[PDB]
């Protein structure tokens, strides 16, 4: 199914991002980078196209792929307030380029969105156009993607993926549970950060990694009942997240979920607000997609065949907010620690994923190294 192929490609890209940022917060969208690279597939030909299709494990034009992706997209948006999620996938191409006959309508038919034509030779004008598109399709939250001097007059093609997420848990953490608690960073140092607390019957599994280390894995359902956040931290303090990160897949997360049972626990979880901008060039080149970035090697002749053309920039920017209101009657019941004899404290670095549970689609994933 496309959901697993799209997710696992995006997870392989995340692994490239994480290894370059091993001791810093990262939030990333596996689904997002797969969705926009699938769009780029339609613009490419020759070796450039083959490199993308190889890395992704499928071809957007093969029988059933594009509609399956439309259903996936139309499905991941549903169970949300307008204030809770917002995504955009966009290809921007120089406006005076003659495009291949029939490309624009075939693109629109496949993805139900349009390639955007912009005049990159008017650099500030073009930067404002891209920035406003991203702003108005991320609920205003990704409001300044490209800074002054980030667009070049010789730019001809830009890819952007931007996502904002602030979903509310099925049981929100109670506001009166807010407190400060020590968080132990990977380098051995500590920092006191705001945390919240909630007792619940949490879906939980203890997972043993191939290297023999125990992980606490916990599910936090979102109010729509279709998305959940999975939290995974080692039981032992000085176990790096990298080892588990480098075997992650949509099926492994489904394996965790299948082994979970609901257990009574007091969960203490930091508040966190993460913001990551990923220059996708190096991670994509590491996965074999080199030609698309090379001015004379790139083949974009399905989009335009009479002018040379390559990707000047490929960016993902993601903003996620966790534990930041609901009605007083709809937050959790506050339960003091005296009433809760079993607890899990997330006071050390952890992995998280936001998952579409009916499909297993990995919408977001990241590491919290310092809240």
């Amino acid at each position, epitope marked *: 199914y496309v959901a697993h192929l799209a997710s696992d490609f995006g997870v392989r890209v995340f692994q490239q991002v994480a290894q370059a940022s091993k001791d810093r917060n990262v939030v990333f969208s596996p689904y997002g980078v797969a969705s926009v690279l699938a769009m780029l597939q339609l613009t490419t030909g020759g070796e450039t196209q083959q490199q993308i299709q190889a890395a992704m494990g499928f071809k957007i034009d093969d029988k059933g792929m594009a509609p399956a992706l439309r259903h996936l997209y139309k499905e991941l948006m549903g169970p949300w307030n307008k204030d809770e999620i917002s995504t955009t996938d966009a290809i921007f191409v120089q406006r005076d380029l003659k495009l291949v006959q029939g490309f624009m309508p075939h693109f629109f038919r496949l993805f139900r969105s349009t390639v955007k034509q912009v005049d990159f030779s008017e650099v500030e004008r073009a930067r404002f156009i891209i920035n406003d598109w991203v702003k108005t399709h991320t609920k205003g939250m990704i409001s300044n993607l490209l800074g002054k001097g980030a667009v070049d007059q010789l730019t001809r093609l830009v890819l952007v993926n931007a996502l904002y997420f602030n979903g509310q848990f099925k*049981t929100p953490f*109670p*506001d*009166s549970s807010t407190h400060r608690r020590l968080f132990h960073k990977s380098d051995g140092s500590t920092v006191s950060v705001p945390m919240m607390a*909630q*007792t*619940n*019957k*949490f879906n939980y599994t203890e997972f043993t990694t191939p290297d023999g280390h125990y992980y606490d894995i916990l599910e936090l359902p979102y109010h729509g009942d279709t998305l959940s956040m999975f939290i995974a931290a080692p039981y032992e303090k000085e176990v790096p997240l990298s080892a588990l990160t480098n075997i992650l897949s949509a099926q492994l997360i489904s394996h965790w979920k299948g082994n979970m049972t*609901r257990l*009574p*626990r007091l969960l203490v979880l930091p508040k966190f607000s993460l913001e990551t901008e990923v220059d996708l060039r190096k991670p994509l080149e590491n996965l074999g997609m080199t030609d698309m970035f090379r001015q004379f090697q790139a083949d974009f002749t399905s989009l335009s065949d009479q002018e040379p053309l390559h990707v000047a920039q490929a960016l993902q920017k993601v903003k996620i907010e966790v534990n930041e209101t609901v009605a*007083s*009657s709809s*937050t*959790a*019941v*506050i*339960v*003091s620690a*005296r*009433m*809760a*004899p079993e607890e899990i404290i997330m006071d050390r670095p952890f992995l998280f994923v936001v998952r579409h549970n009916p499909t297993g689609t990995v919408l977001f994933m990241g590491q919290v190294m310092e809240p």
Partner: nanobody
Amino acid sequence: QVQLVESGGGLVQPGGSLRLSCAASGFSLDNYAIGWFRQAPGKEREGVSCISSSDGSTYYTDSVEGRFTISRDNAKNTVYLQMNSLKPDDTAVYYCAADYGSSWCTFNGMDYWGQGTQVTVSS
């Protein structure tokens, strides 16, 4: 359907006592963890007391320890919450909660919640 119903609420003056009761018509509570939580006007709900389904263990929130006693009447399929030395701050709607086979009360995520009964402590 298991439907918890609370009774025994009322108005008392500071220092007095009430005995709340929780029952579900047609069902024995002896195999449920049974708890009480409360909600004062404008505030978030807070857990107050709990009795295990498995052992004798009981649990009490800090502000009621030594004043409240949760206990079972198995003949009546009932759980009582004895509230002594009531203070104005104990004014709230009090709710019963039940969770099959559990050793303590999470309140959130428990199988069943009652609809509440008013307790008012005032001169």
